[PDB]
Each structure stands twice: as C-alpha cells, then as structure tokens.
Amino acid sequence: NANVVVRLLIRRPECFGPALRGEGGNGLLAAMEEAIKIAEDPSRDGPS
Amino acid sequence: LSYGNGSLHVDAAFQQTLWSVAPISSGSEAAQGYLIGGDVLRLLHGHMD
Secondary structure (H helix, E strand, O other): OHHHHHHHHHHOHHHHOOOOOOOOOOOHHHHHHHHHHHHHOOOOOOOO | OEOOOOOOEOOOOOOOOOOOOOOOOOOOOOOOOOOOOOOOOOOOOOOOO
16 A cells, blocks of 8 residues: 555655655745745735 | 656656567678668769769
8 A cells, every 4th residue: 555655656746745746846844834934924824 | 758858858667658669681681782761872973084
C-alpha cells in the first residue's frame, strides 16, 4: 500500500499542495510560516 | 520534453511525452562496399592519385 500510494502521489504531484509542487512553489517551511501568519491575521483566516 | 525553460529540454520526469521511433539502418547491411547514406568517404579523381 505504501509503494502504491507513493507512486500515485508522485504521478500526480498536485496532491502536495501549492508548496511542494514546484514551478514557483515555495518550501515547506515557507508555506508553514505563511500559514501561521494567515492564521494570526484575520480577514484571511476566517470568512469576514 | 520540458518546455519550462526558454529552450526545450529532455529530462527524466514523471510526466510522459510520446516519442516516435524512426529507422535509419537495419541489420541486413548488404555485403561490403555499396555506399550507404551517412558515410564518411574520400572522393578520388584519378587512378587513386
């Protein structure tokens, strides 16, 4: 199951999100810091 | 075949591109001599001189 899942995920790289996708996607650390900032700042975390 | 760069590149990626295979020469290779396309040769004018 692990091998099959890894193969499918690498066949479809969009599953990793905006980051980790490449071609302009930032690193995992940058994505996590950006998400922390988004959570801290309203009007980007909630609906408003 | 990657178009990402300004020029076209060939890279081993998880995206697949279709390659068409065309033949140049086969294993028959009839006898010797018998000038074949894409050969390196010398053009001699006189009596091998």
